[PDB]
């Protein structure tokens, strides 16, 4: 287990070793439950080819315990053809050599800033969730995920937003997750509370 | 591999081991699939801490392999905060001094008497499933199940009930599961029926 | 880890072991996220008993990693029953000896031709998924899935069908996956696309 306790995560930045896995600071995996580090959570992410999509995950993003980012785009797999078995890469057999590659990527999977994510929850490929998502547990995501949205369910739908359409603007506009330290540590005090408007004051204030 | 074979599961009684667990009588796990013994089915509950919350698990009880109970309430989680960011534990970093304590408990989590639970069902915190209750497979219970309610999906929703509510009424007013051993064999016969309203006077006239 | 990478999966046949598991040819299995060969996918199927339900997999399929076909009907789980503990099946215990056998078989389960089944998907029992059908990660498939049909979900549900219903019809037709090796690399070329009419000519033809 290469996690000591069920309480005690650690960081992605101090974990993550495939070179096609972008991650940001302060986000941190905690998979006691699942014992392995944070690279084998993207499945099927080659560490050798620059060619292939890649897996990004914003700042601050706290995730759960197995949680899985199926990567590899469609993986030889071509629903709209006549058989959908990736006879291109079954090598051995002679007789499927003139079968054409049915490969297709499906874009880098991007996880925004200050996403929380559920344990097991599973991304499908190419998925982009916003800034401040929620992602529940087991919730499968098929598709885009927009900022401070409360997705869950399988397939995953959202719930409900964290905060008004005016709140997430503001959010999204003084954006904290790429404030220098020292303003964090500043303006931890609001960030300890759901008053997005106070906040917004105690930066355009900072600002000057 | 804690169990022997796929069809063989063991007690609760004689597994469980973190003290903030509470199993009954009968009540058994199956967990050959997931070769863990039943305690680390119980996610992130402290066996050192009296004031955490407590999972619960009425008598005769057959729980699948895998399942598993989400524990610790929020985990410092507050999603109405402007930060889903658990700062407060991250110790380390000096900046994130002053954070609050956002966790917050979420109340026991009891399971009733009676509980069939599917293989890798998942319950998140603070749930209270009813006798009788039958949780599906893959099932994530998100809410407070009824008695004798069968339930499944992702969110789970109830799909019917086992019994007629008079039928019910009437199971909940006998209470079987607190029977002293002895009448349990001596209506055995009759446990292996659907017939609610005889299992009912069989009992009535025990009483006396 | 049965498995050297989670690009290079094995064959059916050349880890299949229960007897009571019947693949076909060319159908294949990728588990090095679980690590698991293939015999373990198979839950509660008895290698012993011929008097067992039977997990059956058509020709050419693709099964993603940690896939599960939920075995042994209602492991003696009667629910229509006043009480859905498997007393019979509890020996140690006297008093519980009187019980009757709840045990009830559910019926083979199937899984067609040509059927992509996704990572971590899991099959309750007897259910049977048709040729072409196409299921979902996650899915939890409790019932009947028709060929060709896209389904997901837990419960998993129909998203659409791969192709027309006359589509259909043809490719059910000329039976592709029963066809000759030789005539397998010889349509190739049309496997390779979603032309089921001119596959349909091509095959008529050489048919003469």
Request: with cysteine.
């Given at each position: 287990?290469?996690?000591?306790?069920?309480?005690?995560?650690?960081?992605?930045?101090?974990?993550?070793?495939?070179?096609?896995?972008?991650?940001?600071?302060?986000?941190?995996?905690?998979?006691?439950?699942?014992?392995?580090?944070?690279?084998?959570?993207?499945?099927?992410?080659?560490?050798?080819?620059?060619?292939?999509?890649?897996?990004?995950?914003?700042?601050?993003?706290?995730?759960?315990?197995?949680?899985?980012?199926?990567?590899?785009?469609?993986?030889?797999?071509?629903?709209?053809?006549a058989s959908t078995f990736p006879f291109?890469?079954?090598?051995?057999?002679?007789?499927?050599?003139?079968?054409?590659?049915?490969?297709?990527?499906?874009?880098?999977?991007?996880?925004?800033?200050?996403?929380?994510?559920?344990?097991?929850?599973?991304?499908?490929?190419?998925?982009?969730?916003?800034?401040?998502?929620?992602?529940?547990?087991?919730?499968?995501?098929?598709?885009?995920?927009?900022?401070?949205?409360?997705?869950?369910?399988?397939?995953?739908?959202?719930?409900?937003?964290?905060?008004?359409?005016?709140?997430?603007?503001?959010?999204?506009?003084?954006?904290?997750?790429?404030?220098?330290?020292?303003?964090?540590?500043?303006?931890?005090?609001?960030?300890?509370?759901?008053?997005?408007?106070?906040?917004?004051?105690?930066?355009?204030?900072?600002?000057?």
């Amino acid at each position: 287990n290469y996690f000591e306790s069920p309480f005690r995560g650690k960081l992605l930045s101090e974990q993550v070793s495939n070179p096609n896995i972008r991650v940001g600071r302060y986000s941190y995996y905690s998979g006691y439950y699942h014992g392995h580090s944070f690279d084998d959570c993207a499945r099927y992410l080659m560490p050798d080819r620059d060619d292939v999509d890649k897996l990004v995950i914003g700042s601050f993003c706290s995730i759960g315990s197995g949680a899985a980012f199926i990567m590899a785009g469609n993986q030889g797999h071509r629903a709209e053809w006549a058989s959908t078995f990736p006879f291109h890469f079954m090598h051995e057999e002679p007789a499927f050599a003139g079968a054409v590659n049915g490969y297709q990527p499906a874009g880098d999977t991007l996880i925004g800033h200050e996403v929380w994510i559920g344990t097991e929850a599973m991304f499908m490929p190419g998925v982009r969730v916003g800034h401040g998502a929620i992602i529940g547990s087991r919730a499968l995501v098929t598709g885009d995920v927009e900022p401070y949205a409360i997705v869950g369910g399988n397939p995953a739908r959202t719930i409900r937003k964290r905060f008004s359409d005016g709140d997430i603007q503001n959010l999204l506009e003084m954006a904290w997750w790429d404030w220098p330290l020292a303003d964090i540590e500043a303006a931890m005090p609001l960030l300890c509370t759901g008053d997005i408007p106070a906040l917004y004051q105690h930066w355009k204030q900072r600002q000057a």
